[PDB]
Amino acid sequence: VERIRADRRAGKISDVINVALYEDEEVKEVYINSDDGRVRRPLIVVENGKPKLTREHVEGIKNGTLTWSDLIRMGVIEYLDAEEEENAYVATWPWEVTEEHTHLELMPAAILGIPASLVPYPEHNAAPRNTYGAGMAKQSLGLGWANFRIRVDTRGHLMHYPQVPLVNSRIMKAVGFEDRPAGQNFVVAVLSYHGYNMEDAVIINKASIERGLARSTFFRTYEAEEKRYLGGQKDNFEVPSPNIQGYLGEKYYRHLDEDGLIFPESKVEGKDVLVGRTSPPRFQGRRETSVTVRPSEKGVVDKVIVTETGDGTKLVKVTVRDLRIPELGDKFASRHGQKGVIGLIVPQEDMPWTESGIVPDLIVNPHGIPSRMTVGQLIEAIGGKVASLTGRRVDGTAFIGEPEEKLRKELEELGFKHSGREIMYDGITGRRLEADIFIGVIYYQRLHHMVADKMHARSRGPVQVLTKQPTEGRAREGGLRFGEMERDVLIGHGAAMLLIERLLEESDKTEVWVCESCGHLALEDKRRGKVYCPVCGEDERISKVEMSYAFKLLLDELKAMVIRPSLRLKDRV
Amino acid sequence: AEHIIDNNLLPHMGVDPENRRAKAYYLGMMALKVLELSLGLRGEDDKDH
Amino acid sequence: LGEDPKDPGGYFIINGSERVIVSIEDLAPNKTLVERDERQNKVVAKVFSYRHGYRALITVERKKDGILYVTIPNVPKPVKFVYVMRALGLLTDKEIVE
Amino acid sequence: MKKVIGSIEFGILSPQEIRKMSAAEITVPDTYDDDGYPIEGGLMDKRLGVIDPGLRCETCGARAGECPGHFGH
Amino acid sequence: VAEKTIKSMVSKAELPDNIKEELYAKLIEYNEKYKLKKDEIQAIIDETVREYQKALIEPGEAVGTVAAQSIGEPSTQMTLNINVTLGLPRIIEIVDARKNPSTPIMTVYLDEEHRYDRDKALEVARRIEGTTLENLAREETIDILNMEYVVEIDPERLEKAGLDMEKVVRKLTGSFKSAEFEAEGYTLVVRPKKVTKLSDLRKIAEKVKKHRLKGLSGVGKTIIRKEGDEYVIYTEGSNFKQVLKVPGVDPTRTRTNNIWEIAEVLGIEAARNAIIDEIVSTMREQGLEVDVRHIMLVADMMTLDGVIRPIGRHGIVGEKASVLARAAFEITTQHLFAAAERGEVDPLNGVVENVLIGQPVPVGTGIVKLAMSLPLRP
Amino acid sequence: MIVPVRCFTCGKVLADKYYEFKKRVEAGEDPGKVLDDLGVERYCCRRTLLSHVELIDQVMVYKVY
Amino acid sequence: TLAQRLKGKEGRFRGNLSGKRVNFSARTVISPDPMISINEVGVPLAVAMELTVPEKVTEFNYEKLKQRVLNGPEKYPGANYVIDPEGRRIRLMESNRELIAEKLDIGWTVERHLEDGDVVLFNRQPSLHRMSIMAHRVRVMPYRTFRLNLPVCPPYNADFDGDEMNLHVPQTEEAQAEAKILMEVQNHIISPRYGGPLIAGIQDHISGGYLLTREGAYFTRYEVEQMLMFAGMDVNELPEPDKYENGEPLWSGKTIFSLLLPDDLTIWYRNKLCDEPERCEALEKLIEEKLIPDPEEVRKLAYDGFVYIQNGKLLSGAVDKKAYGREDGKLLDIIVREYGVERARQFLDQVTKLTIWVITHKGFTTAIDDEDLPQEAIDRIHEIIREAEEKVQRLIEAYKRGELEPLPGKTLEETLESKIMAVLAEARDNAGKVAERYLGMNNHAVIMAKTGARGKILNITQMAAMLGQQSIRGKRLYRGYRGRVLTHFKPGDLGARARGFVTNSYKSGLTPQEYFFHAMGGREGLVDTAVRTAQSGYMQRRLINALQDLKVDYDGTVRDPTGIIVQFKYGEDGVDPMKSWQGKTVDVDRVIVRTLLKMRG
Amino acid sequence: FRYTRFEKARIIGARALQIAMGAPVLIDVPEGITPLQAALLEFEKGVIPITVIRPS
Amino acid sequence: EFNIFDHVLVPEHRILSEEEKEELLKKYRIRISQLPQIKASDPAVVALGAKPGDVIEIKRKSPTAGYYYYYRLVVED
Amino acid sequence: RVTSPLSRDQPHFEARDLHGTHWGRICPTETPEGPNCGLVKNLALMSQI
């Protein structure tokens, strides 16, 4: 094992080979792995208490004369899989290495993933809070890609003024998050304000919103193809004539050009036609198959792309952009797992201000901070205030970040309180607040969970063909499901008439003819205007019974399963 | 039975009917590991490792 | 070419849609792991054999009776280890022992 | 007036009951032809109901969306 | 006001018997402290009667659905995972009427001769606890020169087991007649009589080591705790019938975790009481406050037919008279086909069937009947 | 992708002095002293100027028409 | 096939018969609104203009419905559809809105927009209990979010971190009447599960009540008038000032709080702030001796830990979770039981606004110095940690030398593990006590933890002193390499630090190994929750299907649909658990005390 | 004799349904109210004609 | 010997008379098949010497009402 | 992203929890919520395959 390790360190053999030694009184085994799928990490080789990495190697790396592969080649740094690491003894820090140590950790902060490194000071937060912050880091909005306008993504978001965090880890610069930020720095004051920020809710300044803070644009791309059918039939890109079937209306084609394509920079609403298309009839005039905006969505047409598919058919892609000014119900989350929707938009005159002339952009309730054990948020606020005052960004890397006490000392030296508390005045009364309010700069991210895309209201509309029940989804104007648990609470409340109105009257109410002789479903003949039971007869004793259409479907399924349900009718009174 | 033995019992040894000594030796190694774990000679294997 | 320089790549475009393959954390192929089932009171070793994309679960288990058993795919019931040892070419008991 | 369901009696359908309650006999496996019209004697025969809006049921005389459908055998 | 007058007024008042005694005791306690008058006592009695009338539950309440919701909702905040394993698995096992609960625990009480001193409790526990040969042995070694298994035991566990060496060798010799047992020093030597095959040695070696030398079957671990100046014995494993007829054990307060053993030994009513007690104890340990009326309703529904029944497809739901209610819960095809075979008739007297059809449910406002005189004018 | 015209907090105009601030920062000057010399006193305006990242030039290269 | 179309979650029974999608429903994100009553819900204008309620034209509402028809679907308040007595539906547009309006008569149906005072169903999923759906009153708001009052959140278990809720509009008169009578919010203040308050005050209300009613809290005339106007209390003249400071009158917070209580209410108990029982003992003795103590005598020995209300006047004590909190509010529970649900609803609506005004303008905040500790406290915590580590090392050495005594029923390894865990738990408790010693009542986080508003003392302990021992499945961390959780520790090391004992705190900063251990613990907790939820739901469904048909008959018995008597009397006493006093039939002592006080006062 | 919540709800629903399709109000009511509000006012005035049949 | 009724979990069991059973049936307006059932092999039944067809009056120890009366009908195994 | 072939509905208590061998290979904090907790993982920043 020692000879193989020495040969690998000398560069005689490849670095993919990993060797491990297993020693025991009963068994003695040596394992060598050189296959695929092994996840390894680099470690600095430590020999007799001295690491192999010296200052000369660092100088060569900085000067550019040495690369990482060169460092791997000399055996200074080696990749260790899980099997080889069983025999290793890694020191966490360079000043903690001894003669017993066999390896030295390169960067303890590198054990986290890319989204997990976005959180500043993760060691000062609870683990579930760090998990939530890592999860919500992928839901933020910002300048993700510079070529967003030419892309044809189905959904897209764009923050108008993205900002690099003032408190950020050094890994974020190397990863590339600083070039493509997804949030803004918010002046946040921890204060209870009129009960509108309780239960994780937040309060946002009206003037800040009107000045462009957290402004976002939502993109949606629609596509239309001039499909070709058998026999030479094909779709046509033109404004449909009023005489054709399926005509939506005159006002729905007001934005269409003579080629059937919508003009760019045209304001559109729900069910507005973007591409005018017609289709050949089935088994008459041509039908209408135009591509329209979603009923609950609106915006302005951004671009129109005219191209062809792989089969030569015409392809038209239309992108619609909608301005998303923050409002009530818009989800906002910090990097430390603190999330909540906007509870109230408060004018700047009513908002409190400090003795230095600082008005918070956001107000968070103090009740949410200590219960979740989030000290990293307070440290980030202090660091953001210090960075704004000094002009130098505060490093927030894990385990090597700027100490909290240093930030407090810098804040005290800058002329502010060490604790970050400032004297604030009430916006409405104008009097001094009895307590010094903690206020700082916290990086806040706007998430894609917007109330504009979540509000759904259905009264009546399309139903499923099979069950005669309301459809599913906001795009298809569907209804809300009244599940088994909802029926359970309705039963527990003792509301029988409410249950009848919900499950039967408003969902699938229908009437059927039931034969009173054999219990079979009678047949109504519209030709002769008579109702009779085909299996048994009984042209007279036929009664109409109302029930859910789902029950009729169940009866049909039971009959198809060679099961005869006999409905015994009873008088209402 | 011959087809099942050739194409199902340790295919990574091979499907050629000649390659049966290797399958027998691998099964013997498996039995040795089982007996070592049962008699306390060796410890359990961590699946999550 | 209309591409963002910061795009890392590493994905596929299928019919105009970006598809990314997610790595699967599977067990080590052709590796035998021994485990003890306390509820069933048995010792079972399992290996996953790979050959041209085909995976077969070969299981060697020993019950409370002290008799080893071999589980083979396309066989509805477990069979004895000695029977497989005999059918695999080892006739005499000396070869099976050695 | 109106009547409600008092009780439901279950059982096994007899072949005679299946024959009597059937509106048509199905023997052609094919459903639709090249033109898209339903095939007489097929599974989508108009005697069993209508799905297409322009179609008319031969047993009920009603249009799609209000014809309850009819069993075959 | 004399106590006789207060007692007469309490008896004359319309109240339950348990309320009457508590009210009389409270009135007696408050009479000497504040010198209550007759009118004050009468007003107190009237207020108590009014409060009792107000607390009565109105007819038509969906008590079963409310009980199910009030039991299931606290289970959404329960915690998963000596060796008592309470929590959501415990309540799941209780409501599912598991025949053998995981880690059974038997609570054993002692009479007046053993509940005061620790030595009597220890010897009662060692009598209850089942000790076999495999736990007493330090190591297992198969010997081939004598062609028989050899057993050695440590002195500490042998001394604590309460039986000496002679008791051990008399126990195996009487129970096993195929082979004889010889002993010297602190070692067991077994000698065969007609055993020659090596394979037959293993089948007789395992049978010897698993034979129970003393105690009750199914009990392997026993601990003793002190509470309320009394000694209570807690054992691992449940053998209620055997432990009931054991000297030095009080059978009036002895109970077990297994509700099936309670039903088999004590009765169905005792099984219902044990189910109620187990659910209440689990809820109290989890820190969730649940009214006992829901628990007693669940236990009464569980033991309606004289046997313990689960709440799943094999229990209360399985024996429901409604075909549609049975088919809607878990098994649809099997229940419907079984009803078709028997020609079952569903009277639609339940709630689920009326929900499915679209008829008013027989609960809440569904049971209210209205009448009105037609000649009505403003 | 472009510098905001006004500070998001108090509405103070900062876009006029942003390019001078960026030019002086890239020349090796202390950003705090540059902000002080430009009249940027409150740290909210300093937050707006320091945390802004210019990205419009990376968007202009892609034509939409 | 046919079998798969009937069984399963997506089958005909569960997916279409027992539960199905419904019409006249809406769903959007919820936002807080303390200004509306607990009986009201904020409905968006767009939602209100889409959802319609069919109202028949009668003699007393012909003009209103005619105006609704004339307004049209694009003008609020208007209508979308009109149904003639013949039964046909006519859509309303600009061309025919006048013709329909002049054709309106008795018997027509007008599908007008949602207006203020309408009854709708408000539901949050999952519906674990019957309080998950309640009937509210419609309040129309311009924005796009639902608005729910904060005290109604605990019944729904709803927060405002992106929660969405469903709204249902009943269409028939019988359904509307059933929702208005049975399912109103104020009718379900007391939870039937445990017979205690469920619709109660929460964190900010509790903190504001404590700030208002604590000792030394005084307010000026302007503040008192402003909070009275904000809370909506019907007060026309201020009471006599309690004291004068610098020539300006001042009012005690207890005096302002006493305006909420009824004039004939008397109750005394011990709250969560009682840390000196010797001070409550004198108050209890004074109350017991006389039963009508003088108000001046009570105020002389008043204590914040003992709350005493006499004839609606808060003579002593402070407001906390025991006042009107969920599952612990004695005052709210007494108000519900002795004054009805409408009086309780008014009291809750007034007190929430009053406490919100008090906490808003006084200033409540938390900062980084709330978890700060002096150097002596940190030194004591470090000494405790070092002593615990030394004890663990001594136990390990004793186990290695064989001197460790095995515990009954366990071997050496489990005995050593139990001893180590007990030592670490004792060290954590000692560190928590040391931290609690130096955190006074002036700290806002300590106020929140002690009053029961939000958080616990342990939460402050973790950030201040130390985190403690990280464990999964009730055992110390062991999953990793051979003999060690991490490579950075030596193999075979059974010490505290190598097994998941975090000596650092959140403020001090966790080491990478401690970070990994805390991540393991958090992952275990998240996995436990995500596994427990499914089993709890399955058990709830099984119980619901087992006990769906049981109900109380007119004779007090509970019977199955067949007719078999399950209980000859529900609960063996015929008492609703919702109306039961702490699980008992009748609270005799409370009735006796209240009647005696009423007759002697 | 006192009305239960279910009985009161059923009576109010029946009265509101009657008012919706005829059945003029027996007491003076303010203009612009719903039939449910009229039924609630009638119940508050104690003028309802609908009785409850109970088992005996 | 240890009586089965001395246990704290076992309530008092008493066999109802014919007139008492008829009065119980008349009071609740139920048939003999609408009562809760108890097996003939139950320890309480074999301790009381009852036979299938009888009704057992059970005096439960009610946590809420103090004493509660329950009735069970003896049925064959 | 790294995923596991195990079923999401089953509680894999031994597989969902963070292992000691995930140091430097699997991110300890970035995991999804719900059935994917502990079964869907992400590569560490220092991880090499």
Ligand SMILES: [Mg+2]
């Ligand atoms: Mg939430």
Ligand SMILES: [Zn+2]
């Ligand atoms: Zn017929």
Ligand SMILES: [Zn+2]
């Ligand atoms: Zn038809």
Ligand SMILES: [Zn+2]
């Ligand atoms: Zn500014």
